[PDB]
Design a protein around this nucleic acid. Sequence first.
RNA 1: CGCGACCUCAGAUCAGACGUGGCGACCCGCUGAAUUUAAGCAUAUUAGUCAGCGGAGGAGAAGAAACUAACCAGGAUUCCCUCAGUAACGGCGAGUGAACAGGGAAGAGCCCAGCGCCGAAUCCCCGCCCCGCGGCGGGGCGCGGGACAUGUGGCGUACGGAAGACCCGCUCCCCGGCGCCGCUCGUGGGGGGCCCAAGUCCUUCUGAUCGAGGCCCAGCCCGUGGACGGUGUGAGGCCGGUAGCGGCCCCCGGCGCGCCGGGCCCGGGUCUUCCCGGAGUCGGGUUGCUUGGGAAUGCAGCCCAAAGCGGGUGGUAAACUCCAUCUAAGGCUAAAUACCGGCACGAGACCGAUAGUCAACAAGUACCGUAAGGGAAAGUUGAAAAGAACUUUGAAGAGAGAGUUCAAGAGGGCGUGAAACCGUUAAGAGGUAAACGGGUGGGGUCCGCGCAGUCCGCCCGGAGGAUUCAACCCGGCGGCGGG
RNA 2: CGGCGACGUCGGCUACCCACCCGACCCGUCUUGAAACACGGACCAAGGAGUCUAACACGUGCGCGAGUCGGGGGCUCGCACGAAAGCCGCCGUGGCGCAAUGAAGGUGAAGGCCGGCGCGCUCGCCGGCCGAGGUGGGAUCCCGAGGCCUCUCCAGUCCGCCGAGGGCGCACCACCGGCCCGUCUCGCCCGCCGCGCCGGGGAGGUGGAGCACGAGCGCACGUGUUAGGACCCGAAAGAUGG
RNA 3: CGACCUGGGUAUAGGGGCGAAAGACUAAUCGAACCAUCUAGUAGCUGGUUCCCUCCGAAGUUUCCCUCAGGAUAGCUGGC
RNA 4: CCCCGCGGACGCUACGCCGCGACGAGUAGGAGGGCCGCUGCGGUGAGCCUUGAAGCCUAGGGCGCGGGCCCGGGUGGAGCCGCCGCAGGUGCAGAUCUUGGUGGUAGUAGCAAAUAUUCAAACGAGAACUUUGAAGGCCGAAGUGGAGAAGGGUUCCAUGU
RNA 5: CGACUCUUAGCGGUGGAUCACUCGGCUCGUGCGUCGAUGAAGAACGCAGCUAGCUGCGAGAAUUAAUGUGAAUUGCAGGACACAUUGAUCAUCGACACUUCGAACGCACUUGCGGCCCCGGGUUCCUCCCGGGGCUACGCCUGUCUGAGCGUCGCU
Lengths: 134, 158, 263
Amino acid sequence: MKFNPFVTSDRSKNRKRHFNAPSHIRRKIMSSPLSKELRQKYNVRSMPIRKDDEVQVVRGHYKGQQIGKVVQVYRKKYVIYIERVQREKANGTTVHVGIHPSKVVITRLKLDKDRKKILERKAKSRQVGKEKGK
Amino acid sequence: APSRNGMVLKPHFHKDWQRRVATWFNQPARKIRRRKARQAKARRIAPRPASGPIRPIVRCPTVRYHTKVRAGRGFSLEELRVAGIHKKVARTIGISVDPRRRNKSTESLQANVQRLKEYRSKLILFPRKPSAPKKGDSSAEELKLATQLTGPVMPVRN
Amino acid sequence: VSELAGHQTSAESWGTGRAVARIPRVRGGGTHRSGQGAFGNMCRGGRMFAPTKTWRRWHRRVNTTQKRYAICSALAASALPALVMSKGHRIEEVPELPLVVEDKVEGYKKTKEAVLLLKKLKAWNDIKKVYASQRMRAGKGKMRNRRRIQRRGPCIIYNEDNGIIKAFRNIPGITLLNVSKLNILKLAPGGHVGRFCIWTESAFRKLDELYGTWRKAASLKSNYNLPMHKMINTDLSRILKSPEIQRALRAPRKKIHRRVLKK
RNA sequence: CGCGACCUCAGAUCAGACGUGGCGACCCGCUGAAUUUAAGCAUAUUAGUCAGCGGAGGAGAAGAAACUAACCAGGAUUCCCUCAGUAACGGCGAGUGAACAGGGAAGAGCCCAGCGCCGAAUCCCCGCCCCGCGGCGGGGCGCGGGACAUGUGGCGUACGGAAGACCCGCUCCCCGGCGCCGCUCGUGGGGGGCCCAAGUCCUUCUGAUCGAGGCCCAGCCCGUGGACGGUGUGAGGCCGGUAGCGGCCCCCGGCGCGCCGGGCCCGGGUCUUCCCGGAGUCGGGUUGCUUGGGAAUGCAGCCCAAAGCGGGUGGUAAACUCCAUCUAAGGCUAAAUACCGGCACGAGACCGAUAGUCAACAAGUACCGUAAGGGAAAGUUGAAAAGAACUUUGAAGAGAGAGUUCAAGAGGGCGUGAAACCGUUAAGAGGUAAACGGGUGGGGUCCGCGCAGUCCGCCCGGAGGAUUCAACCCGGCGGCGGG
RNA sequence: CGGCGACGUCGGCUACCCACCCGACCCGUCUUGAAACACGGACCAAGGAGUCUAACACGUGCGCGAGUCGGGGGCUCGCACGAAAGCCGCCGUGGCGCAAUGAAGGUGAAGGCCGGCGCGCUCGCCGGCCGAGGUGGGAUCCCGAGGCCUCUCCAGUCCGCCGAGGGCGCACCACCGGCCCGUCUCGCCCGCCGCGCCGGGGAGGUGGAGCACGAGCGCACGUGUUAGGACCCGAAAGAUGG
RNA sequence: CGACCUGGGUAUAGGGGCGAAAGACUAAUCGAACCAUCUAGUAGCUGGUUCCCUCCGAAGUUUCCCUCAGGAUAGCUGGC
RNA sequence: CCCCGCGGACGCUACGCCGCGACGAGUAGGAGGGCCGCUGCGGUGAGCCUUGAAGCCUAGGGCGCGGGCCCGGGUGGAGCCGCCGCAGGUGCAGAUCUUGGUGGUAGUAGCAAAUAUUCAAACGAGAACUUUGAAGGCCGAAGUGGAGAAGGGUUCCAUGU
RNA sequence: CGACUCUUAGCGGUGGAUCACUCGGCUCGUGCGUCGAUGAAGAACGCAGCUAGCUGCGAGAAUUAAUGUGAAUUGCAGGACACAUUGAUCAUCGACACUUCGAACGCACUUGCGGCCCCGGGUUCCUCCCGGGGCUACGCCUGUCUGAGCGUCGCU
Ligand SMILES: [Mg+2]
Ligand SMILES: [Mg+2]
Ligand SMILES: [Mg+2]
Ligand SMILES: [Mg+2]
Ligand SMILES: [Mg+2]
Ligand SMILES: [Mg+2]
Ligand SMILES: [Mg+2]
Ligand SMILES: [Mg+2]
Ligand SMILES: [Mg+2]
Ligand SMILES: [Mg+2]
Ligand SMILES: [Mg+2]
Ligand SMILES: [Mg+2]
Ligand SMILES: [Mg+2]
Ligand SMILES: [Mg+2]
Ligand SMILES: [Mg+2]
Ligand SMILES: [Mg+2]
Ligand SMILES: [Mg+2]
Ligand SMILES: [Mg+2]
Ligand SMILES: [Mg+2]
Ligand SMILES: [Mg+2]
Ligand SMILES: [Mg+2]
Ligand SMILES: [Mg+2]
Ligand SMILES: [Mg+2]
Ligand SMILES: [Mg+2]
Ligand SMILES: [Mg+2]
Ligand SMILES: [Mg+2]
Ligand SMILES: [Mg+2]
Ligand SMILES: [Mg+2]
Ligand SMILES: [Mg+2]
Ligand SMILES: [Mg+2]
Ligand SMILES: [Mg+2]
Ligand SMILES: [Mg+2]
Ligand SMILES: [Mg+2]
Ligand SMILES: [Mg+2]
Ligand SMILES: [Mg+2]
Ligand SMILES: [Mg+2]
Ligand SMILES: [Mg+2]
Ligand SMILES: [Mg+2]
Ligand SMILES: [Mg+2]
Ligand SMILES: [Mg+2]
Ligand SMILES: [Mg+2]
Ligand SMILES: [Mg+2]
Ligand SMILES: [Mg+2]
Ligand SMILES: [Mg+2]
Ligand SMILES: [Mg+2]
Ligand SMILES: [Mg+2]
Ligand SMILES: [Mg+2]
Ligand SMILES: [Mg+2]
Ligand SMILES: [Mg+2]
Ligand SMILES: [Mg+2]
Ligand SMILES: [Mg+2]
Ligand SMILES: [Mg+2]
Ligand SMILES: [Mg+2]
Ligand SMILES: [Mg+2]
Ligand SMILES: [Mg+2]
Ligand SMILES: [Mg+2]
Ligand SMILES: [Mg+2]
Ligand SMILES: [Mg+2]
Ligand SMILES: [Mg+2]
Ligand SMILES: [Mg+2]
Ligand SMILES: [Mg+2]
Ligand SMILES: [Mg+2]
Ligand SMILES: [Mg+2]
């Protein structure tokens, strides 16, 4: 349990910190789990959600295996939008349904020079923890 | 109004006492703050005995307490003289000279010079330049026997 | 509460010639607040009756002899299965109710070997009761960081700390007590005696010199001896059935004389 | 009748600096009530308090005895416990009210003037060069200015000091960098950044699941991590985190040694000879305030006004006498201590939208007053706007259908939705206002799934079934008793 | 022992409406007396008033007990809990208690019996013992004559019950003596390194919140009184600064 | 046609101002303005003072008080 | 030295159970009990709950002397309670009580100071009140006219609702 | 029989209690403990593509630079943004900048009125106009320059 006397377990402080988070640490809050194939090829469990990576919804109304590309992450709303996860409104047009990124699993990442660097840094840290836990 | 039979009580609560109320909720916090400052001070003076300098034997100054003895502010200049140590180097040795105390008794005098002389024997003095031991001590008993002394330097006992 | 609460208003009493109550009323005239009652425990936004102060004497001091007395009583209750069962601790498969393990468990390091020890000792059923008792509190405690509640597990009382605290302390309900410094708030959690306690070998042997016997005084408390009984044989059945008691008695009058209707 | 020196003044948008105002919770210096209590009230109390004025710092003030004591003596200041509601003050009424000793926290000591000696040895400012920058210093150079004998610096300060000899020990400083330590102790010393375990497994509930059952071996997996929050429910394993003398990268600081730069070069004993102190101050009278201080505790005004084996204190005024104790009228000094303002945190047996701050919200806001100033009310759709397309009546507000949603009997002041009050519907009743207590009667809405009305212990008879009943034999286990 | 039981009826005094008989003035308050032509109250919702601190007194519970109490400080992995807890003992300083009395100087709580002896002088020497005296009550306890039995007598073997009387007497009460301190009256002795305006002693009354084989200390709770805003609301005023 | 009416600018501020004088006026306030604070001022006086059963159950009288609408005191009450 | 048999109701939370006798008014006031009620804390119920918590509604069924409580049905949609202790900002009909809301009065008082309106048309869904024209009037130059000063601050002017 | 009135119930209104929730308080504790003429606190006025309030900011105005981070911001639009011939956003913040009042500083509160010194234009140097820049508060310290005195003196 929490022993560090400089990090709070207060409910109100944690909720206030969560809902008023700046965009750059709102990005970390929106991390999403990686698939089994992605977890084996890399050594990282969770990854912050990107703009154009494929994903499948595992909870809610839109569960299934339809691998949909993320098309927008709305950090103001704490939701992401996916290609085929849509709903038709009264007028007949289609709008996306926002789902929390914790309820999706990433199946392929969007790799850049930065994504590889963060991918490799989490793998090296888990390796360090594993060797310490030999 | 007095009811039947009791003390004639005179509370001292006519002076708006609720603004000058000292609560003690920071007592446990103060004890920790004083404790760790004691630990930090002791570890700063690494071989020095962690609790201030040696203090003299001192008789309490009243017919109620003159049977008991305690530790005074410091050694007087006459006890320092007959122990053959200078009043300036004494405080660097950790002896706490007190210049405004006088000795009107030889037994009280002799008691505090035996305390100083047998303190000097128990002293271990580190050379100021460790490379060259000039007049301080021998390296053999410098290494093993040099430890921080907790509690008062040898305490007075009745 | 705030010492200024309800009194930063500057309200006058409004008089008595006007057909309103004589409570102080807020001055002004351009607000809703103007003309409303103030300063009263009966007034909205006013000061409560007898505002609570910080100098309320929150702490109590108990005599050291009494505090040791309770600890001795709590320890004596933990060795009687009827009392510990009456605390609802699920000890039916455990042997030798005052339960002592070797000091090897003092040097444990991982939760895996701590759980395996509890299962082998057959003390795990009490842990499973703690898990099943994990639920959400009722009332304002949830808003005040006391969200979830659970039961009390067994107490592991050790002598030295060679990793036993880290091995345990992730099991819900488990409390480590360090026999050198007991705690009546943890030996009798609700004020009720009879907590399930597991001892190590070094802790059990130290107990005798920590509180003393009756024939010898405690060597780790410098003045303490065990409290004495006012009733050595506290079993009425044997006493009342003992022959010496029975020879002195008179024959019982067991026939019932009910009221006889006056014909 | 000019030119110089000094003195005392003046000007400058002169060269270079400094102060002003704010906050003020804590702290320092003044000033300073009345309500109130005394069952009236004037001394007293409130109270040296509120209000008022000034000045600071991270603390401030105090502080190294013109002390306490009367002991076998203690030994700066400040804070805690105690002394102690005590000695004492008090229309001796109401009430007020310390100190010493003792035990602790902390602990630290010193510097001038004077008296003297030393060729003013002293200091500031302006230029030169180089060593440098990094809050600006070092060195030397100036037949460069100024301050200063109306007294700068070195030695030295009441614990005595100085100067000569005699003896002894040579015994050895601080400040700035280079490289590395030690690897900086609560284990990093701090600040910042990024990361690090394990189920979204099987079957099911649901609008949604974080719910419910299951996961062989002794058991789903991790656990030094089962704090917390988010996520469409209630999550140790979905996410952020949490644990960890865990990892990585930047920045900064005090630390020890080899080196370099500078300066800085006598300390202690014995003897002799010298030298020693703060004045309109102490103290006294009187007045006013103040204190527990009482023939006057302290402070201040006015008058008087010192001494040097003197002076102060020695809690009853005075004279004589012995003794004790300190050395006033100059200055500095950390720690323990305080903190309702500020920056950043953590927590709670607190409050839960008439509560808790006035303010959970575009709150010191809207608004009021010429102004000083007074000062509110006001939280909640839904998981997701999916925020009602489209048809129709009306000029529109507003409806009827339709549609979304699990739900609009959740439709933008929309969670739930009480009472008072009202509309309608149904039943009943109604000329002593209603309403009420006891007693029945009538009607009605519902309840008894009321409606052939017990059960079950022994025995008798009929009619069936099956092991097996008893008794022994073997094995296990208990209760009781045993010199 | 009888009758009646399903789409019509049985039971349900509770509950809804209505009817009738008897009774029935509107509550709170102040008051001798309220239905009052006495005051407050149109209605509903929410809020709303003996609290906390300190000091006493008594009762009760608890621990220890001539003691008791760490409350202030200090010592214990790194503080989730834990600002808790544990420990100190040459940390018991100190507080209350164990000694009272007087303004103070000060003084300061043990009696009874037996023998010789002074003169057993209302009184000195000791010797021996015992250790707070005595009277009247006094729960409880102890002894106890006499009794009470067995299918039955002679001779006692075991204990049990009732029991006239007697005995030791707790606590406590009433009374009488005794002891300590202050103060009066009377009177005679004794001590010495200081022979003193010295010191001590006796008897008889009186003043004391005393002694007379301790009961307190700490903690908690309740009640009552008080100082504090002090159960809540309420003046006419007074003062300070604007 | 006057000791006349009136605008604007100035001066006088609370125990103070100003008044051909009424205690008049001084921002609808004047026999002492308004604002904030001391202040939750004091009140022997008025009003209120929140759940249920069970048990017991009064006094308006004595003495003293600047006492007579209050208190102390003794009685009456309850509890242990 | 029981027995053809192998047997023989309930009880005694001792803070429990049982028996007998007498008694029962009550303001002010005192005390006891409360398995009366509210909120939060430590224990405890292998307690309850999206197969539906709290809250609210109820011609539903009951229990208790009572405070009150349990149960059925409805609504609601996320939490809650029993028992042993602990702690209170713990119980309302009143205070010309505070805040908020709502009634009867009541479709009532009233929309009566300064002489006065009428005809046709246009726009418009809609005209006593707008606009145009015609008529009858009023202010009557110390104005119901035309301009400013203080004061206000965009009220000025167009267009639209 | 209607109507009206009363009681009870269903439904519907009015109203916003109750309950549940809480990015708010209150209380306690901890570590720091830092404003200003190098112009503070405070006020005014401005600044967004669409912006009234709140918030942030200062004519570089809902922000520039730098450093960490690493693909958004979001109500709509817009154009960005190769993420290495260097990067959206956010955070940090040490560079830069920071309107007018205000201790408030040329005088005064009327954007009123000056003075001195440089620069650019009109001049076509001579100094009148326009613009830009820098100075111009009080008290006080050290020094400097210039001084005053039938103040005390010296030399003629
Ligand atoms: Mg309030
Ligand atoms: Mg609740
Ligand atoms: Mg200048
Ligand atoms: Mg008075
Ligand atoms: Mg009075
Ligand atoms: Mg008076
Ligand atoms: Mg003040
Ligand atoms: Mg100042
Ligand atoms: Mg200072
Ligand atoms: Mg000082
Ligand atoms: Mg005392
Ligand atoms: Mg005083
Ligand atoms: Mg110390
Ligand atoms: Mg000199
Ligand atoms: Mg001195
Ligand atoms: Mg959650
Ligand atoms: Mg969770
Ligand atoms: Mg994870
Ligand atoms: Mg960590
Ligand atoms: Mg005297
Ligand atoms: Mg509020
Ligand atoms: Mg509410
Ligand atoms: Mg408010
Ligand atoms: Mg505000
Ligand atoms: Mg619904
Ligand atoms: Mg709804
Ligand atoms: Mg609603
Ligand atoms: Mg009345
Ligand atoms: Mg009357
Ligand atoms: Mg009466
Ligand atoms: Mg009445
Ligand atoms: Mg009448
Ligand atoms: Mg009246
Ligand atoms: Mg009325
Ligand atoms: Mg009312
Ligand atoms: Mg402690
Ligand atoms: Mg003692
Ligand atoms: Mg007797
Ligand atoms: Mg007697
Ligand atoms: Mg009493
Ligand atoms: Mg009051
Ligand atoms: Mg009180
Ligand atoms: Mg008042
Ligand atoms: Mg007066
Ligand atoms: Mg008159
Ligand atoms: Mg007026
Ligand atoms: Mg006045
Ligand atoms: Mg009198
Ligand atoms: Mg009366
Ligand atoms: Mg009767
Ligand atoms: Mg009765
Ligand atoms: Mg209350
Ligand atoms: Mg209420
Ligand atoms: Mg009410
Ligand atoms: Mg009408
Ligand atoms: Mg009319
Ligand atoms: Mg006319
Ligand atoms: Mg117009
Ligand atoms: Mg109805
Ligand atoms: Mg309704
Ligand atoms: Mg930038
Ligand atoms: Mg002008
Ligand atoms: Mg001259």
